[PDB]
Design an enzyme around this catalytic site. Structure first.
Site, PDB file in Angstrom:
ATOM      1  CD  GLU A   1      -3.048  -0.832  -0.013  1.00 46.44           C
ATOM      2  OE1 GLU A   1      -3.028   0.171  -0.722  1.00 46.44           O
ATOM      3  OE2 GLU A   1      -3.911  -1.782  -0.164  1.00 46.44           O
TER       4      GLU A   1
ATOM      5  CB  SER B   1     -12.279   8.826  -2.591  1.00 45.35           C
ATOM      6  OG  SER B   1     -11.884   7.703  -3.311  1.00 45.35           O
TER       7      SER B   1
ATOM      8  CG  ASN C   1     -11.204   5.451  -0.576  1.00 48.33           C
ATOM      9  OD1 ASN C   1     -11.414   6.625  -0.678  1.00 48.33           O
ATOM     10  ND2 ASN C   1     -11.551   4.588  -1.543  1.00 48.33           N
TER      11      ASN C   1
ATOM     12  CG  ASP D   1     -15.947  -3.530   6.189  1.00 49.00           C
ATOM     13  OD1 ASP D   1     -15.650  -4.665   5.714  1.00 49.00           O
ATOM     14  OD2 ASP D   1     -15.924  -2.454   5.563  1.00 49.00           O
TER      15      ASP D   1
ATOM     16  CG  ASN E   1      -8.928   6.260  -4.626  1.00 46.84           C
ATOM     17  OD1 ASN E   1      -9.378   6.407  -3.406  1.00 46.84           O
ATOM     18  ND2 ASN E   1      -7.895   5.610  -4.894  1.00 46.84           N
TER      19      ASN E   1
ATOM     20  CG  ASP F   1     -14.065   7.393  -6.011  1.00 48.71           C
ATOM     21  OD1 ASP F   1     -12.931   7.908  -5.679  1.00 48.71           O
ATOM     22  OD2 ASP F   1     -14.715   6.628  -5.258  1.00 48.71           O
TER      23      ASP F   1
END
Ligand SMILES: [Cl-]
Ligand SMILES: [Cl-]
Ligand SMILES: [Cl-]
Ligand SMILES: [Cl-]
Ligand SMILES: [Cl-]
Ligand SMILES: [Cl-]
Ligand SMILES: [Cl-]
Ligand SMILES: [Cl-]
Ligand SMILES: [Kr]
Ligand SMILES: [Kr]
Ligand SMILES: [Kr]
Ligand SMILES: [Kr]
Ligand SMILES: [Kr]
Ligand code: NA
Length: 129
Positions: A35, A50, A59, A101, A46, A48
């Site tokens: 990462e 983000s 994120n 999650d 990103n 999008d």
């Protein structure tokens, strides 16, 4: 801060990630390697709009507030800048929430593609833990 490999392993362990949700420490070190290359100040962002922050590239779409991700959430209740600190506490606490999650470490695409199923214990080999 750019951590050394064993240094990060030790920090993650002190912060309770070893075996958290069943993921051994090498999984977490491997994810951080791919990462961020162990750099707390990493950002990316990103498509999008983000942004991913910190050693685990968390994120702003869901997890932190950066003020510039429309329609997003802040489920970790933190500014995204906290994820860039030399102190990994905020990144660890938020990662604990993410991995809980429902898709486990698959939340990190790079973990799935580069760590999952591999000899992740190699990432903590030799370290004093
Ligand atoms: Cl390394
Ligand atoms: Cl391991
Ligand atoms: Cl926002
Ligand atoms: Cl901007
Ligand atoms: Cl929220
Ligand atoms: Cl904030
Ligand atoms: Cl730390
Ligand atoms: Cl799982
Ligand atoms: Kr530790
Ligand atoms: Kr801690
Ligand atoms: Kr940064
Ligand atoms: Kr960025
Ligand atoms: Kr972390
Ligand atoms: Na957000």
């Amino acid at each position: 801060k750019v951590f050394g490999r064993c240094e990060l392993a030790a920090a993650m362990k002190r912060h309770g990630l070893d075996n958290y949700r069943g993921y051994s420490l090498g999984n977490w070190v491997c994810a951080a390697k791919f990462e961020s290359n162990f750099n707390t100040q990493a950002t990316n962002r990103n498509t999008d709009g983000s942004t991913d922050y910190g050693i685990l590239q968390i994120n702003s779409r869901w997890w932190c507030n950066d003020g510039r991700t429309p329609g997003s959430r802040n489920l970790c209740n933190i500014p995204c800048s906290a994820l860039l600190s030399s102190d990994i506490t905020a990144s660890v606490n938020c990662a604990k929430k993410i991995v809980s999650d429902g898709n486990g470490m698959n939340a990190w695409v790079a973990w799935r593609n580069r760590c999952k199923g591999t000899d992740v214990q190699a990432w903590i080999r030799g370290c004093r833990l």
